[PDB]
Amino acid sequence: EYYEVFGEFRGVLMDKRFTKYWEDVEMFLARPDDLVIATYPKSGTTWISEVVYMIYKEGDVDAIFNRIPYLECRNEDLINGIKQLKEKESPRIVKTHLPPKLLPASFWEKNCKMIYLCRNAKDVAVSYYYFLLMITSYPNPKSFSEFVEKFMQGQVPYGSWYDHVKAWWEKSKNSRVLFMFYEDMKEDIRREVVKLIEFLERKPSAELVDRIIQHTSFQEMKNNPSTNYTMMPEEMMNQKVSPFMRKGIIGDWKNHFPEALRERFDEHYKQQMKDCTVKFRME
Amino acid sequence: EYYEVFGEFRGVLMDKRFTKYWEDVEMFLARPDDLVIATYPKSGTTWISEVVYMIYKEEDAIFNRIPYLECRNEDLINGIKQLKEKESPRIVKTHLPPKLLPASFWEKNCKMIYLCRNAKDVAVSYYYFLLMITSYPNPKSFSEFVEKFMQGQVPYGSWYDHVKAWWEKSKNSRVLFMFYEDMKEDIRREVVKLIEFLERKPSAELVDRIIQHTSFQEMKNNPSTNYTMMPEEMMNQKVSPFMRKGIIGDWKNHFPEALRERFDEHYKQQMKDCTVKFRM
Ligand SMILES: Nc1ncnc2c1ncn2[C@@H]1O[C@H](COP(=O)(O)O)[C@@H](OP(=O)(O)O)[C@H]1O
Ligand SMILES: Nc1ncnc2c1ncn2[C@@H]1O[C@H](COP(=O)(O)O)[C@@H](OP(=O)(O)O)[C@H]1O
Numbered sequence: 001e002y003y004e005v006f007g008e009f010r011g012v013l014m015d016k017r018f019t020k021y022w023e024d025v026e027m028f029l030a031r032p033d034d035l036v037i038a039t040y041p042k043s044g045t046t047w048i049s050e051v052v053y054m055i056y057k058e059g060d061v062d063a064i065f066n067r068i069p070y071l072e073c074r075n076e077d078l079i080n081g082i083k084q085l086k087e088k089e090s091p092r093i094v095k096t097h098l099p100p101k102l103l104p105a106s107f108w109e110k111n112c113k114m115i116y117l118c119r120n121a122k123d124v125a126v127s128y129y130y131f132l133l134m135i136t137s138y139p140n141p142k143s144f145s146e147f148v149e150k151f152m153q154g155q156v157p158y159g160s161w162y163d164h165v166k167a168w169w170e171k172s173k174n175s176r177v178l179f180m181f182y183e184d185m186k187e188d189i190r191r192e193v194v195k196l197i198e199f200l201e202r203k204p205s206a207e208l209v210d211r212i213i214q215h216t217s218f219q220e221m222k223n224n225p226s227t228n229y230t231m232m233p234e235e236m237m238n239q240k241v242s243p244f245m246r247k248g249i250i251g252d253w254k255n256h257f258p259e260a261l262r263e264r265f266d267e268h269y270k271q272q273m274k275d276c277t278v279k280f281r282m283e
Numbered sequence: 284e285y286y287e288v289f290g291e292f293r294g295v296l297m298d299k300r301f302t303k304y305w306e307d308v309e310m311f312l313a314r315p316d317d318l319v320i321a322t323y324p325k326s327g328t329t330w331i332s333e334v335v336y337m338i339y340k341e342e343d344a345i346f347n348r349i350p351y352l353e354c355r356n357e358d359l360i361n362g363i364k365q366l367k368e369k370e371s372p373r374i375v376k377t378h379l380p381p382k383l384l385p386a387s388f389w390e391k392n393c394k395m396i397y398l399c400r401n402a403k404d405v406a407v408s409y410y411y412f413l414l415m416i417t418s419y420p421n422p423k424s425f426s427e428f429v430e431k432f433m434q435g436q437v438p439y440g441s442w443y444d445h446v447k448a449w450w451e452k453s454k455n456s457r458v459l460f461m462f463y464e465d466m467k468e469d470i471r472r473e474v475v476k477l478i479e480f481l482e483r484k485p486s487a488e489l490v491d492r493i494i495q496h497t498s499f500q501e502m503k504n505n506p507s508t509n510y511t512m513m514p515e516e517m518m519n520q521k522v523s524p525f526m527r528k529g530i531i532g533d534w535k536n537h538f539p540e541a542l543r544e545r546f547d548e549h550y551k552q553q554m555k556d557c558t559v560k561f562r563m
Contacts, residue, residue, distance in 0.1 A: 063358040077344040077512035079359075137516055231358040235417055235516045 002139050012102065012159040018072050024082050025072055028104040033091040035200075036107060036114040037068070040164045041097050041157070042127035043119040044182040046244075049095060050216050050227055051193065052115070055200055056093070059211040063231040071096045097158050100167045111176060115199075116168045119182035120280055121161055121269060122253035122262075125151050129256075130242045136235065144256055152268050162272040169278050183250055183281040189213055218248040250283055285420050295380065295440040301353050307363050308353050313387040316372045318481075319395040320349070323445045324378050324438070325408035326400040327463040329525075330497065333508060334474065335374060335396070337493045338481055344512040352377045378439050381448045392457060394480075397449045400463035401561055402442055402550060403534035403543075406432050410537075411523045417516065425537055433549050443553040450559045464562040467531055470494055499529035 009019045037052065039045045049068050054061075069084040071094055085092060096103065107114075129147045132138045141147040147156075154160030172179040178199050185192045193212055197204045214220070221227045222245040229237060229244040237244070257265070292302045320335065322328045332349050350365040352375055366373060377384065388395075410428045413419045422428040428437075435441030453460040459480050466473045474493055478485040495501065502508045503526035510518060510525040518525070538546070 066358060075514055077347060078514050078517075233356055233359055233517075236514075 005137065005139065006157060010102065012099065013155055013157060014159075015157055017075055021074060024074075025104060028071075028082060028085075028106055030104065030106040030110045030112055031090055031092065032110050032112065034094055034107070034110075034112045035091065036094050036096065036103075036112060037117075038096050038098070038103075038114060038168065039117045040119075040124065040161050042124055042131055043117055044185065045095065045097075045117070046227060047182075047185065047216065047221070048115070048117050048180070049093075050221065051196060051212060052093060052200070054212050054215060055197055055202060056091075058202075059208045061211070061215055062226070064227050065232070068093045068095050072098060099159065099164050100171055113199075114171075114177045115180065115196075116172060116177065117180050117182065118165055118168075118278075120250075120283070122257065122265065123250065124161060126252050126256050127246070128156065130246060134237055134239065134242045134244070136238055145258070145261055148257075148261060148265065152265065162269075165278065166273070166276050169276065179278075181281060183283060186250055187281065218245065221245060222248075288418065288420065289438060293383065295383065296436055296438060298438055300356055304355060307355075308385060311352075311363060311366075311385040311387060313385065313391050313393060314371055314373065315391050315393065317375055317388070317391075317393045318372065319375050319377065319384075319388060319393060320398075321377050321379070321384075321395060321449065322398045323405065323442050325405055325412060326398055327466065328376065328378075328398070329508060330463075330466065330502070331396065331398050331461070332374070332376060333497050333502065334477060334493055335481070337496065338478055338483060338489075339372070339374070341489070342507040345508050346513070349374045349376050353379060380440065380445050381452055395458045396461065396477075396480075397453065397458065398461050398463065399446055399449075399559075399561075401531075403538065403546065404531065405442060407533050407537050408527070409437065411527060415518055415520065415523045415525070417519055426539070426542055429538075429542060429546065433546065443550075446559065447554075447557050450557060460559075462562060464531055468562065499526065502526060503529075 005016065006013050007016050007019070008014070009022075035052070037045070037049055039048075046064065049064060053064075053067060066084070069081045069088065069092075071081050071085070073079060073081040085094065125148055126144075128151070129141060129144055132147070133140050141150075150156050151161070154163065158164070169179065171177050178196075180192065190209065190213065193209050194204045197208070225231060230239070234240070253262075288299065289296050290299050290302070291297075292305075318335070320328070320332055322331075329345065332345060336345075336348060347365070350362045350369065350373075352362050352366070354360060354362040366375065406429055407425075409432070410422060410425055413428070414421050422431075431437050432442070435444065439445070450460065452458050459477075461473065461476075471490060471494065474490050475485045478489065506512060511520070515521070534543075
């Protein structure tokens, strides 16, 4: 059952396997040069992770989940992201989906640089729906509408999308925390890549920016076994049900939200984000 | 499908995930002080592994403390990688017949321990293992599985060829040969023998500690050794538990009269000229 698999932890619904040994996350030790990449699930985490990795390697083309460990991921003794990080050489790149109040405090104390990425809410809901169908140990939603009712209530893994975006937007007041959008990478990739190269204190030569653009397109990454998640067992992630690199577009909500549901969602959204100044792209 | 999952490799039926990158196993580099623990599947590997570990030490999972050499599942599981990062002295687990073991182990004259169990009881234990592993097709019936076992058409091949080849290798003083039934009927003697082979001093305290920590009851309730630290998506113990019965003679509850006579007759032909001594 749904609530046998997921449980509320300090006000946030979570996979019980990731909270059984919470002490290991709470007491994590950060290093001054660690870089944190944070996102709400299904907002483009894999895409921006590959872009940053290429920058670290000066455009020189192991699975991505080994090169950039998923911090809180844990499944008893078979999978352990904290252990992977303790054995990783500096400078480390860290992936997470946690809201600010649950992130290890050591990261704030050492003032580490961080990058936060978001995507428009309706398109996130469609992508997250297919993800639950893909993960074998997660109960399949009865219908898309049923899933959306839960999304609006914050009753899905990692909690409320609204609370997540608003809290991280507040944190981005700091010059060492960069805030970005999926739709901006889609409509103006060259500008977004140059911005990332400069934030990471490197030089944006024309040759470098070009290698990155060609290597990280949707067509390329869909055929790259290192980034398309085929290096992960079908017993856990069944891509025959739904592929990881699905569509990669803006606007798929138009093929899933019935008229009546869309109006209720948008109305609810306005009340939740009323006083938030974040600037999403007109689409 | 059975043959979509398994394929013959150099005359031995194997899980295709363990042979896709065979070069990594073939070229493996051994160290002079490495110790190899070898067995045919379901003969008591976990039991003797814990005994040897306690000896070395005078709670991470056992599959992390003692890496499974040829085990591989793309980039999620890799036993060779685990061994390259392990500090000496290393303890290595394997189910490979002598002709497939990395040659570096023979070249450096490493010490090894081989363990076996009577064939009929191995067949019962292996049958439940296939039901437990989610990615392995469930046999239609026990009899169907036994027909395949006699033909050597199960993972890791012929049990008969495996035991006969390792018995010949045990002529070497650095390769110790042991039996599951001897550990069951005379544990104190088998433990003292292992302590001496590993060049350590057998004492009252040491032998008794190991005896009580390695009983079937103790290991069944130890999360480090009962395999509950391994995902249910891969190993479903609701179908059948890893620490199942732990006895001698369960074949009496599974083999019909007619099948037993055919099996024993076949066994005779296969083991005709082998001097190995199983317990009555
Ligand atoms: N290079 C790329 N260009 C565009 N979209 C990409 C991409 N790489 C991954 N994606 C998309 O990012 C989403 C996965 O997000 P995450 O990595 O955070 O889990 C998927 O969305 P869709 O399901 O809408 O296709 C996926 O197709
Ligand atoms: N301490 C112990 N005492 C007795 N039997 C043990 C044991 N530890 C494991 N076993 C048995 O060894 C078999 C598993 O073998 P392996 O370790 O090679 O995979 C199982 O046999 P059964 O299925 O007959 O119960 C299991 O119960």
